[PDB]
Design a protein around this ligand. Structure first.
Ligand SMILES: *[C@@H]1O[C@H](CO)[C@@H](O)[C@H](O)[C@H]1NC(C)=O
Length: 270
């Protein structure tokens, strides 16, 4: 019989009427030191928050009513062994898009995220890489249940993380007003010209902008005043309303009563 130990975030996890007690020592040491709060537990997990680049060994004392055995584990460095735990995920849905809110699931530990998504009916998985912690997936079908799981990563330290539990959400009934489409910027004179397509006539629109870098690991979208409630599928505004830089633009439609969901966010490099 022998034991190994895995680490997820701040927990030692044992892999093989019994209780467990954990000791450790720094490698090249005589005696064993008890890990506080990890003595006579039923759980195979020991939370050790309270120096992860130092080499250590563990000793696990497996006890019963009248007998016990003490197993040592090979030397390890906790950081090198650690696995990143499953992130916490919350989903929200529109008719044709899903928004994924992600946050870490702390002593051991910036994270890069990835996900896997599939339609419940089909099970065909699409993998999306390098997503951020409020990612939006477009081009989905209304009243359709999608399922997904998310993992964290630390590409610098070559760690690939554990997937969150699966979460599913059903997209809502189709919005009668679809989002504006095909958004494009061009320049005329000292102005920018924002153009888009729309499926219905006699609509009004609004355009909002955001500094693009603000999207990472999160800010208020702001109106472009000239574009506010425009009655056609374009607006013209002075170049000098934006400093040089990288922005995001989005457009929403209205019939005076209801609004579409937002168009996709488009990159705007001045
Ligand atoms: C779809 O959902 C059913 C439960 O309704 C579940 O049993 C099944 O595993 C899911 N399949 C996929 C591919 O997500």
């Amino acid at each position: 019989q022998k034991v190994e130990v895995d680490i997820i975030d701040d927990n030692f996890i044992l892999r093989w009427n019994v209780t467990f007690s954990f000791d450790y020592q720094k490698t090249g040491m005589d005696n064993w030191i008890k890990l506080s709060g990890c003595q006579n537990i039923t759980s195979t997990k020991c939370n050790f928050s309270s120096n992860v680049y130092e080499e250590i060994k563990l000793r696990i004392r497996a006890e019963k009513e009248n007998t016990s055995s003490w197993y040592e584990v090979d030397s390890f460095t906790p950081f090198r062994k650690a696995q990143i735990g499953p992130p916490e995920v919350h989903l929200e849905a529109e008719d044709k898009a899903i928004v994924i809110h992600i946050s870490p699931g702390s002593v051991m530990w910036s994270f890069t995220y990835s996900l896997v998504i599939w339609k419940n009916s089909s099970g065909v998985e699409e993998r999306i890489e390098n997503i951020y912690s409020r990612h939006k997936i477009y081009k989905l079908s209304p009243e359709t249940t999608y399922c997904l799981k998310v993992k964290a990563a630390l590409l610098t330290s070559w760690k690939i993380g554990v997937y969150s539990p699966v979460h599913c959400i059903k997209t809502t009934v189709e919005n009668e007003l679809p989002p504006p489409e095909n958004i494009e910027v061009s320049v005329q004179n000292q102005n920018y010209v924002l153009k888009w397509d729309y499926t219905y006539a006699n609509m009004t629109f609004q355009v909002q902008w955001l500094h693009a870098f603000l999207k990472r690991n999160p800010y208020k979208w702001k109106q472009i005043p000239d574009c506010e409630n425009v009655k056609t599928t374009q607006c013209v505004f002075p170049q000098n309303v934006f400093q040089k830089g990288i922005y995001l633009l989005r457009v929403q439609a209205s019939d005076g009563n209801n609004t579409s969901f937002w168009s996709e966010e488009i990159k705007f490099d001045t």
